[PDB]
A paper describes a structure:
Here we present cryo-electron-microscopy structures of 17 distinct compounds from six different antibiotic classes bound to the bacterial ribosome at resolutions ranging from 1.6 to 2.2 Å. The improved resolution enables a precise description of antibiotic–ribosome interactions, encompassing solvent networks that mediate multiple additional interactions between the drugs and their target.
For the tetracycline family, we included one pentacycline that bears an additional ring E, as well as two clinically approved third generation glycylcyclines, eravacycline and omadacycline, which were developed in response to increasing tetracycline resistance, and differ from tetracycline by having extensions on the C9 position. The high structural conservation also encompassed the water-mediated interactions as well as the position of second-layer water molecules. However, despite conserved scaffolds, some variability is observed within the conformation around ring A, which influences how the Mg2 is coordinated.
Residue numbers in the entry:
A (entry chain M): 2 to 116
B (entry chain I): 4 to 130
C (entry chain G): 2 to 6, 10 to 154
D (entry chain J): 5 to 102
E (entry chain N): 2 to 101
F (entry chain C): 2 to 207
G (entry chain B): 6 to 227
H (entry chain S): 2 to 85
Write the structure that this text describes.
Amino acid sequence: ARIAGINIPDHKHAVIALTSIYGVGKTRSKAILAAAGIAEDVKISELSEGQIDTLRDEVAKFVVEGDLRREISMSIKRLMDLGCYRGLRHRRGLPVRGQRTKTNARTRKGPRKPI
Amino acid sequence: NQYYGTGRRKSSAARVFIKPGNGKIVINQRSLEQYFGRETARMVVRQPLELVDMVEKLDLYITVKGGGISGQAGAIRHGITRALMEYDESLRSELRKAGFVTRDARQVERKKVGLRKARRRPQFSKR
Amino acid sequence: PRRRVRKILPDPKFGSELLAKFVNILMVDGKKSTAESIVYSALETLAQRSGKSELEAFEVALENVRPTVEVKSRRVGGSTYQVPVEVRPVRRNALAMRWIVEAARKRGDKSMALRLANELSDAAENKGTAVKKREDVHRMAEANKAFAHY
Amino acid sequence: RIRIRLKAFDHRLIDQATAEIVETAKRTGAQVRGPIPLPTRKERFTVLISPHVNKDARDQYEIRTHLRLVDIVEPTEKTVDALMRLDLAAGVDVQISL
Amino acid sequence: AKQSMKAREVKRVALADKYFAKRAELKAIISDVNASDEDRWNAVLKLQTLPRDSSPSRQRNRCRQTGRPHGFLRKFGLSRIKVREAAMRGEIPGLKKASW
Amino acid sequence: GQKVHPNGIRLGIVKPWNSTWFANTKEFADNLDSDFKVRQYLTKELAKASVSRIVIERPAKSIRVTIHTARPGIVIGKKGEDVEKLRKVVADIAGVPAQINIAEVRKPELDAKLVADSITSQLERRVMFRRAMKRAVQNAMRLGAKGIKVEVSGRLGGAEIARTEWYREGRVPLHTLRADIDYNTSEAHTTYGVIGVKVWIFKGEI
Amino acid sequence: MRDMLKAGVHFGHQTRYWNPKMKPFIFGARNKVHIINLEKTVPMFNEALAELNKIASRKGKILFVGTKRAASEAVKDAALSCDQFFVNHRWLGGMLTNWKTVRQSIKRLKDLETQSQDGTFDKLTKKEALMRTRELEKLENSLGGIKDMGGLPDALFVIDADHEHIAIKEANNLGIPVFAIVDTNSDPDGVDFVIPGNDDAIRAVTLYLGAVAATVREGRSQ
Amino acid sequence: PRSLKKGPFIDLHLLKKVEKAVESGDKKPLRTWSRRSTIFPNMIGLTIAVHNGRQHVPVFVTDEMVGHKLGEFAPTRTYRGHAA
RNA sequence: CCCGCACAAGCGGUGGAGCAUGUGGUUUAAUUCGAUGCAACGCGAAGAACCUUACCUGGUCUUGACAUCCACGGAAGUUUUCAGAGAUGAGAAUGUGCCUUCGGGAACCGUGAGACAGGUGCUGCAUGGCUGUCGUCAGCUCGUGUUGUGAAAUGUUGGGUUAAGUCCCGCAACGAGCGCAACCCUUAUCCUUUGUUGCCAGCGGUCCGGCCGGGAACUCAAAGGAGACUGCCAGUGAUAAACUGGAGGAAGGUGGGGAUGACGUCAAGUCAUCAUGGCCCUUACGACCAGGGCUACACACGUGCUACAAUGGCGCAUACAAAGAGAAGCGACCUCGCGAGAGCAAGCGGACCUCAUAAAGUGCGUCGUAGUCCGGAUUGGAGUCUGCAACUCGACUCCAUGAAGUCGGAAUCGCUAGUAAUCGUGGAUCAGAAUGCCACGGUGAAUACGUUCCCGGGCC
Ligand SMILES: CN(C)[C@@H]1C(=O)C(C(N)=O)=C(O)[C@@]2(O)C(=O)C3=C(O)c4c(O)c(NC(=O)CN5CCCC5)cc(F)c4C[C@H]3C[C@@H]12
Ligand SMILES: [K+]
Ligand SMILES: [K+]
Ligand SMILES: [K+]
Ligand SMILES: [K+]
Ligand SMILES: [K+]
Ligand SMILES: [K+]
Ligand SMILES: [K+]
Ligand SMILES: [K+]
Ligand SMILES: [K+]
Ligand SMILES: [K+]
Ligand SMILES: [K+]
Ligand SMILES: [K+]
Ligand SMILES: [Mg+2]
Ligand SMILES: [Mg+2]
Ligand SMILES: [Mg+2]
Ligand SMILES: [Mg+2]
Ligand SMILES: [Mg+2]
Ligand SMILES: [Mg+2]
Ligand SMILES: [Mg+2]
Ligand SMILES: [Mg+2]
Ligand SMILES: [Mg+2]
Ligand SMILES: [Mg+2]
Ligand SMILES: [Mg+2]
Ligand SMILES: [Mg+2]
Ligand SMILES: [Mg+2]
Ligand SMILES: [Mg+2]
Ligand SMILES: [Mg+2]
Ligand SMILES: [Mg+2]
Ligand SMILES: [Mg+2]
Ligand SMILES: [Mg+2]
Ligand SMILES: [Mg+2]
Ligand SMILES: [Mg+2]
Ligand SMILES: [Mg+2]
Ligand SMILES: [Mg+2]
Ligand SMILES: [Mg+2]
Ligand SMILES: [Mg+2]
Ligand SMILES: [Mg+2]
Ligand SMILES: [Mg+2]
Ligand SMILES: [Mg+2]
Ligand SMILES: [Mg+2]
Ligand SMILES: [Mg+2]
Ligand SMILES: [Mg+2]
Ligand SMILES: [Mg+2]
Ligand SMILES: [Mg+2]
């Protein structure tokens, strides 16, 4: 139920429930459950508190949640402080990976700012 | 002994060998049920024999290459029809009336220059 | 067209050209096998809820959704008059089947087979959006009964 | 066995060239398998025909490569002599394999 | 195309022929799994020092009649425009207008 | 509208190719380029010899060039001396041993290229375009053309506004694929720029 | 004259439709119908036969133009017995004035005629051969009479100057003497030798046609 | 990125200018057009004046820059806003 | 009075979202040039990291990068060093050939003149050529004749009829030409011939694999034929053309699809493919180089792709294509890697080998209507490969991230059948770089009462 300082959904299959953790996608979720010897399709509600403790130990091997959030934040901060091209793109809120800005780039730019 | 018919439909060609028997149908070394999952495909194959009432009086040995499920079922139907008319020439008018004798000559129309497909034109804008 | 010039094959399970046409109306993207499975699933459910046969229970749903009359925008100077026209029998079925499918797609049940069985059972008892559209079409034809003869 | 593969862009040339090859071989105590008509390669080319723009204005061209296989079985020495002194039409590529 | 642009292509083809074997030998070392890190490093540095125009990727296929750098067809060695002109005069063997 | 090239559309139907060699992709572009250089050389060198058509064959490791000419004696020369000069140069260009054959054009008034070249020669010598066109048409029809069309386009008579003028006699059925339409073009390089000539000669069906 | 009115040369057309230029050859308006004056007719009919003899004894050509559904038969007999030429269906406008062109249709008929007899028809297809078969029949109805007539005519015997206004106008332009059966309802101006006559009754037509048959035949006899 | 089996790319001309600079302790900026060169550890402390298309932008190399290309620190496009 | 997806009847879209892409604009040192209503805007470009490249900044050259001629030295080359971003400059090794009348040569190099070269500089409104467009619309004309003082008319209008100035009939027209149709390619049926690399019906095997003897049947390959003509029949129609049915037939009324574009129109597009009159530059508007730019981003428009889910997502299992490409190429098998890939290394210039596995489908399971087990944008980290080189600015992979989006206002687009819709597959260009383009099959609809209306057009 409570893993990595968040409430994982009890009703969902374990493979999906563990993807509520920031830093656990489908692949890591499958690896955690494989390493714990828990089947993917077991609902979290159906697991014993012994099994939840094994899941906590497997999740602890990965960087997740606030630790991952701080790593990502630090990685962007590093770029922005360097003043490298990617850093400047982060600062300006423009695409960082070569994409066109003549059109699109709306994910980065946000909604259209009319003149 | 063995009455033959070639049948074709789209890009499929079927080789149908009909002998007196008890309603055996082999298609590419598989049963009709194994070869075609679709009941429409199975219906298409059985149509000629159901029409002439020889469903359990003939063994069919069929090979079929090319096209898809529906193409192959239609190729087979055309092949059975032609095999039946080699077996018994009086069946032609009944099979002709059912539409089974015709080689359905509808083929994929080629893609053309300036069109997205055969006829689908790119979207126009006034300006 | 300016110069006035296909034959549907009957469906495998039941031998109906009307149900073959129904599958075609339900079908999207050439996926006839998918459409066939939905219709035969829906008709099993419909035949189990009524005790009437699949085609018979289908015909009762069509009975209640088929329009007799509809309007046609027939422009005859100035404004355009909605003219009540008799719906010919093939178009009666066509509209009924289209409305049922349109209605079933709008419903909130899980699968289309269930949505469709519900709409067909609702059609049989005169309590769906398909029956409603027939009533809507009839009242607009009733409201423009003045403009027959056009 | 002498395998002769003939290629040409004209089928009338390739049919003349095979006719001569089956003639010379069958004269000279050889058993000729063929000519076998192997699949024609249709190589297609689509070009814009305007010097500028007009993307939908195009020509579609095709080079058909016709292909014939002749096999000379249990070839005589007279056979092999006569085949090499034949002179097929320019326009027919002749690949011999033994 | 300008005469100079045609001349640049001739230069690039000539250099690519001249250095082909040397470049291949250097890139074999750089690619090689079993080579030393020193030998791979030195080979990386050596491949830089060769003329850039010795790389085949520097060559642009140009129409052999006009020098046009766009619309090339490799079969003919010509731009689309010169293919069509030659095609219609019967100068490209086998080539005719296609329908199917 | 724009019209299909009359020669090109008839290429497997009633009209032969001018290059009749086979090649795989490896040699194909090289052969076209050598053919181009051979035709370029010969067209220039035999500008006064009334050359209609240069047919190129490549038998084995060689080139065979048939020069269709209205004036074969001038091409061949004095005991085949001039054609031997051509052969040596063609062999250098092609980079393979060359044979040059000379085919005679018996009727240069029915040869679209020679008619086109005749008109452009006259236009460069400031003959009135209408006179050149009319004689070309008259001569072809006298010598048994089933029809002829001549089109001349550009700054006719050194006019500022370019125009197209054409004359037709007889039938010139360009949509009939079995029609033996001899078609060719020429450019007159005048003091006011390029006048283009097009000649279509119909010589019956099939 | 007693036979002219037995034949019915006497009774002209109704008075409603008359041409006033034909009044000198109208004796009565008896019973709402103009009656042609035979005393004007017979002197004028014989001087027509006089000149037809003088033309036909110069050994020239007569063209029997009579293109109505009643005289088409007799003009195609009074020119065969006579050994002369006829037009018995639609006069093609420009037959004489555009003879240069219309002679090319004569030449095409003669090609098609040989093709029918030889059976180059049989060698060609159903579509092709039956098209040139029908083309033969169409050319024969129009130009069957004037096929063996490589030259503009020397006379133009006409029945009804009203119907053959085109033919007469053509003959007047080229300087060919017309010999028209000009009716009461018809213009005599262009005609050279006016024969005042009922131009419709088969029996009236046959009578004229036997006289012009003879006079030309007698021209050829001498 | 350049495959690890090939190692980091540096232009030989820059590599030798850096080696000379470090060996001499020369603190004059190294003028380069080699934007594509990887920043190596031995470049740390050098000013490298990297061409941006029209100017040589002084890049004082720090340890965090190692592994980046020099061109990353010399932006080539000038933009100050549309309504500026 | 007619026609055309013109409308109507339908089905699916666009317009809203994210992204791709083009354009405008703005910005910039430069964002190279061109295309601009339909008929510009995934257009020239069938593929901008460098190159390409035409632009910018800076570094450079001046008879020149690319020709011919002359003179004067030199074989050409191959090595290698320093400086330089490179262009290039300064060298140092090592050649000493090929024809030879033994005088010469002329191979390919400098170098010095100057006659010239050079120009993607300008004018598409000086042009050729090529192209778009009305429109594959059924038209447009001519000779001769005739009519009119004449511009002109007639033919070509009219009655029927046709997809069609198609055909018939009438007719001062008679004929003809260019268009229509046909001839061409492909597709649907059959026959003959040939039978490997394709094929396997019957045999004989057999390790179960057409695998091997064999067989030449069949599929198929591809040459040559046959076949469809309103030919036949009935009715209708003017004793017409034709039309409406019917038969037979694989196919039926132009069977389906393509190619094929009349006279002309828009001074339409292209002097940047090329060519070309004129003009202009000539130690520069030419030429070489490195780096940058063409990829910029308050924004507007066009064309697409991917979605928004349950007719679906995911997992597992498992069917059935066509077309095509390949030698500095396609690359199997095996091994290694989670994977992109890597390492070995067969085969194949191909009906043989390889790309290569079709996917939708089907079966079973799961999810249970949620911003989700929908979506997959964005961003972090780590990689792979091509390539001298992926910072600006590549594609791809892995882990993580998990945006907008709940079917889109006015308006607007495509499509009449193997079509639309949907599903994969291939190719050109190309080192690498497709959601574009061109092509290929699979599954496979709905609807058309009609011609009042909207748009374009034809005839009087
Ligand atoms: C697409 N568009 C913008 C127009 C458009 O819509 C259409 C259309 N038909 O729809 C068009 O015609 C156009 O495209 C077009 O092509 C044009 C020209 O050519 C042109 C031209 O060349 C000159 N030329 C000169 O006066 C040259 N000079 C002589 C003395 C010195 C200068 C003058 C001139 F007014 C024009 C008109 C344009 C109009 C243009
Ligand atoms: K997660
Ligand atoms: K960008
Ligand atoms: K032009
Ligand atoms: K006229
Ligand atoms: K110019
Ligand atoms: K760049
Ligand atoms: K796209
Ligand atoms: K869009
Ligand atoms: K999700
Ligand atoms: K890049
Ligand atoms: K939308
Ligand atoms: K590529
Ligand atoms: Mg990008
Ligand atoms: Mg398709
Ligand atoms: Mg497009
Ligand atoms: Mg191939
Ligand atoms: Mg040039
Ligand atoms: Mg390239
Ligand atoms: Mg990385
Ligand atoms: Mg509509
Ligand atoms: Mg949108
Ligand atoms: Mg632009
Ligand atoms: Mg312009
Ligand atoms: Mg320009
Ligand atoms: Mg305009
Ligand atoms: Mg560049
Ligand atoms: Mg250096
Ligand atoms: Mg110039
Ligand atoms: Mg223009
Ligand atoms: Mg007209
Ligand atoms: Mg016509
Ligand atoms: Mg054939
Ligand atoms: Mg029929
Ligand atoms: Mg046609
Ligand atoms: Mg203009
Ligand atoms: Mg550059
Ligand atoms: Mg661009
Ligand atoms: Mg998902
Ligand atoms: Mg490829
Ligand atoms: Mg592939
Ligand atoms: Mg599935
Ligand atoms: Mg249509
Ligand atoms: Mg697709
Ligand atoms: Mg019309």
